[PDB]
Every structure is written in C-alpha cells, then in structure tokens.
Write an enzyme that holds these catalytic residues in place. Structure first.
Site, PDB file in Angstrom:
ATOM      1  N   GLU A  65       0.833  -1.191   0.000  1.00 41.56           N
ATOM      2  CA  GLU A  65       0.000   0.000   0.000  1.00 41.56           C
ATOM      3  C   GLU A  65       0.876   1.252   0.000  1.00 41.56           C
ATOM      4  OE1 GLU A  65      -2.828   2.023  -0.768  1.00 41.56           O
ATOM      5  OE2 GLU A  65      -3.696   0.114  -0.110  1.00 41.56           O
ATOM      6  N   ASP A  93      -2.287  -5.225   0.941  1.00 37.95           N
ATOM      7  CA  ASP A  93      -1.596  -4.136   1.621  1.00 37.95           C
ATOM      8  C   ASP A  93      -0.192  -4.489   2.085  1.00 37.95           C
ATOM      9  OD1 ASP A  93      -3.818  -2.433   1.337  1.00 37.95           O
ATOM     10  OD2 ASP A  93      -4.709  -3.155   3.207  1.00 37.95           O
ATOM     11  N   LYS A 119     -15.332  -7.838   2.822  1.00 38.83           N
ATOM     12  CA  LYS A 119     -13.927  -7.852   2.425  1.00 38.83           C
ATOM     13  C   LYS A 119     -13.536  -9.203   1.841  1.00 38.83           C
TER      14      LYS A 119
HETATM   15  O1  LIG Z   1      -6.004  -0.759  -1.605  1.00 35.92           O
HETATM   16  C1  LIG Z   1      -7.169  -0.391  -1.752  1.00 35.92           C
HETATM   17  N1  LIG Z   1      -7.647   0.056  -2.911  1.00 35.92           N
HETATM   18  C2  LIG Z   1      -6.808   0.232  -4.087  1.00 35.92           C
HETATM   19  C3  LIG Z   1      -6.682   1.690  -4.485  1.00 35.92           C
HETATM   20  C4  LIG Z   1      -6.111   2.625  -3.412  1.00 35.92           C
HETATM   21  C5  LIG Z   1      -6.954   3.856  -3.610  1.00 35.92           C
HETATM   22  C6  LIG Z   1      -6.814   5.153  -3.139  1.00 35.92           C
HETATM   23  C7  LIG Z   1      -7.778   6.083  -3.503  1.00 35.92           C
HETATM   24  C8  LIG Z   1      -8.848   5.724  -4.312  1.00 35.92           C
HETATM   25  C9  LIG Z   1      -8.999   4.434  -4.786  1.00 35.92           C
HETATM   26  C10 LIG Z   1      -8.023   3.526  -4.424  1.00 35.92           C
HETATM   27  O2  LIG Z   1      -8.023   2.213  -4.792  1.00 35.92           O
HETATM   28  C11 LIG Z   1      -8.140  -0.388  -0.603  1.00 35.92           C
HETATM   29  N2  LIG Z   1      -9.387   0.042  -0.847  1.00 35.92           N
HETATM   30  C12 LIG Z   1     -10.270   0.078   0.155  1.00 35.92           C
HETATM   31  C13 LIG Z   1     -11.679   0.545  -0.145  1.00 35.92           C
HETATM   32  C14 LIG Z   1     -12.635  -0.647  -0.367  1.00 35.92           C
HETATM   33  C15 LIG Z   1     -13.355  -0.349  -1.679  1.00 35.92           C
HETATM   34  C16 LIG Z   1     -12.310   0.408  -2.449  1.00 35.92           C
HETATM   35  N3  LIG Z   1     -11.837   1.308  -1.397  1.00 35.92           N
HETATM   36  C17 LIG Z   1     -11.666   2.633  -1.559  1.00 35.92           C
HETATM   37  O3  LIG Z   1     -12.561   3.323  -2.041  1.00 35.92           O
HETATM   38  C18 LIG Z   1     -10.357   3.269  -1.139  1.00 35.92           C
HETATM   39  S1  LIG Z   1     -10.481   4.589   0.104  1.00 35.92           S
HETATM   40  C19 LIG Z   1     -10.201   3.829   1.675  1.00 35.92           C
HETATM   41  C20 LIG Z   1     -11.165   3.949   2.678  1.00 35.92           C
HETATM   42  C21 LIG Z   1     -10.959   3.363   3.913  1.00 35.92           C
HETATM   43  C22 LIG Z   1      -9.801   2.662   4.164  1.00 35.92           C
HETATM   44  C23 LIG Z   1      -8.837   2.536   3.189  1.00 35.92           C
HETATM   45  C24 LIG Z   1      -9.034   3.121   1.953  1.00 35.92           C
HETATM   46 CL1  LIG Z   1      -7.796   2.943   0.756  1.00 35.92          CL
HETATM   47  N4  LIG Z   1      -9.922  -0.351   1.411  1.00 35.92           N
HETATM   48  C25 LIG Z   1      -8.650  -0.802   1.690  1.00 35.92           C
HETATM   49  O4  LIG Z   1      -8.365  -1.169   2.840  1.00 35.92           O
HETATM   50  C26 LIG Z   1      -7.744  -0.811   0.634  1.00 35.92           C
HETATM   51  O5  LIG Z   1      -6.510  -1.248   0.913  1.00 35.92           O
HETATM   52 MN   LIG Z   2      -6.680  -2.336   2.987  1.00 34.78          MN
HETATM   53 MN   LIG Z   3      -4.761  -1.581  -0.140  1.00 35.45          MN
END
Ligand SMILES: O=C(NC[C@@H]1Cc2ccccc2O1)c1nc([C@@H]2CCCN2C(=O)CSc2ccccc2Cl)[nH]c(=O)c1O
Ligand SMILES: [Mn+2]
Ligand SMILES: [Mn+2]
Length: 180
Positions: A65, A93, A119
């Site tokens: 991450e 991550d 999840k």
């Molecule tokens: O790695 C992840 N996503 C890959 C990239 C990384 C990234 C950054 C910005 C915008 C998009 C984006 O996608 C990732 N995503 C999620 C959730 C679940 C549905 C998708 N999501 C988001 O909307 C991202 S906001 C968010 C909210 C709370 C905690 C952590 C985050 Cl990151 N939760 C995770 O714990 C995780 O690790």
């Molecule tokens: Mn995560």
């Molecule tokens: Mn992630």
C-alpha cells in the site's frame, strides 16, 4: 472551498502519510479537497499499515500500500515468483515474509463482522490473510491468527481511538461516521 476535515487531516497525520494519500487519491481520480472524509480514511488506513509493518522483525513485512499502482504490482509479482504464492486478483496491503502470505488491512466505523464478510466477498482469494481494526478497539483476523504481538495491535487500536476523539472534539466525527 476549504473544509475543516481537510485542515484536520493535514494536522493530524505526518506529512509523509498525507502526500502518499494525496498522490493515491489523484492517481485514482478523486480530489482530497472535496471527498475529505475519504481523505481522512486513506491517511488512517495508511498509518495503520505502517504501524503494522513496524510490529514484526526488521525484514518481515513488505509494504504494498502507498506505492503507485504499477510499482505495487511489480513488488507483488516479485514476491509471487519468489515465494511460489498465487498472484492475488486485487492489490493487498502487505506481505508477511515469516508466515508467507499477503495481508489485507481493513479499518472501519461499523461492525467487524460486517466488513470482514464484504472484504472476503470482494477478495475471493483464499490465501490472503485478512485483518480488520475498528475505531472502537475491535479486531477480527482470518482463522483468529492476529499475526502480531498483543502490544503491537494494542498500539494500533489506541491510535485509532485517539483519531476519533480528535474528530469528535471538532464535531467532524458524525459526518465521518455517516460517510462509510
Ligand atoms: O487498496 C485499496 N484500494 C486500491 C486503491 C487505493 C486507492 C486510493 C484512492 C482511491 C482508490 C483507491 O483504490 C483499498 N481500498 C479500500 C476501499 C474498499 C473499496 C475500495 N476502497 C476505496 O474506495 C479506497 S479509500 C479507503 C477507505 C478506507 C480505508 C482505506 C481506503 Cl484505501 N480499502 C482498503 O483497505 C484498501 O486497501
Ligand atoms: Mn486495505
Ligand atoms: Mn490496499
């Protein structure tokens, strides 16, 4: 327009976390100036990942991450073709070099049972360990294997509760709770 949540996020988390979150949001096309609640959530999730990495030995955890999307995948393939571990469909991550498994880290404002289920529904990868933390001090890991020391997980939990207190002291907690 400049919100209160934005000015709080930049003051709460260290600058290295903020710009890693800012770069990640813009990389996926979302503005930290407007979606301020998700700005706070990424900084929070990012800090938990770094604290988690600081829990084991020196060269135990590999952080995926925070990286750019291309480099985050580059590290995964290197690990996969080194470890003989199946390539996950979605970006995890971390990677545990001691237990030989990728880790998905969740941070929620809801029930730990609820978020784990969704999840695992989106993951669909049986090998990647899942570890959820909550702003109330709850945690649920796959096969009840919490990986880290009791002291290391406890440090994460108290940090999360400090964040909610600081948000609540600025009346931003209610809006943050209803955003997830
Ligand atoms: O790695 C992840 N996503 C890959 C990239 C990384 C990234 C950054 C910005 C915008 C998009 C984006 O996608 C990732 N995503 C999620 C959730 C679940 C549905 C998708 N999501 C988001 O909307 C991202 S906001 C968010 C909210 C709370 C905690 C952590 C985050 Cl990151 N939760 C995770 O714990 C995780 O690790
Ligand atoms: Mn995560
Ligand atoms: Mn992630």
């Amino acid at each position: 327009r400049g919100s209160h949540m934005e000015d709080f996020v930049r003051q709460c988390f260290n600058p290295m976390i903020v710009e890693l979150a800012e770069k990640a949001m813009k990389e996926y096309g979302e503005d930290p100036k407007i979606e301020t609640n998700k700005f706070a959530a990424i900084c929070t999730h990012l800090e938990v990942c770094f604290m988690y990495s600081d829990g084991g030995s020196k060269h135990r955890f590999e952080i995926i991450e925070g990286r750019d999307r291309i480099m985050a995948w580059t590290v995964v393939n290197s690990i996969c073709n080194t470890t003989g571990v199946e390539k996950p469909k979605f970006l995890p991550d971390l990677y545990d070099y001691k237990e030989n498994r990728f880790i998905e880290i969740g941070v929620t404002r809801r029930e730990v049972h609820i978020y784990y289920l969704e999840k695992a529904n989106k993951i669909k990868s049986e090998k990647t360990h899942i570890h959820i933390f909550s702003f109330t001090g709850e945690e649920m890991a796959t096969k009840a294997d919490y990986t880290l020391d009791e002291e290391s997980r406890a440090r994460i939990k108290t940090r999360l509760f400090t964040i909610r207190q600081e948000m609540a002291s600025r009346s931003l907690w209610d809006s943050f709770r209803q955003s997830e």
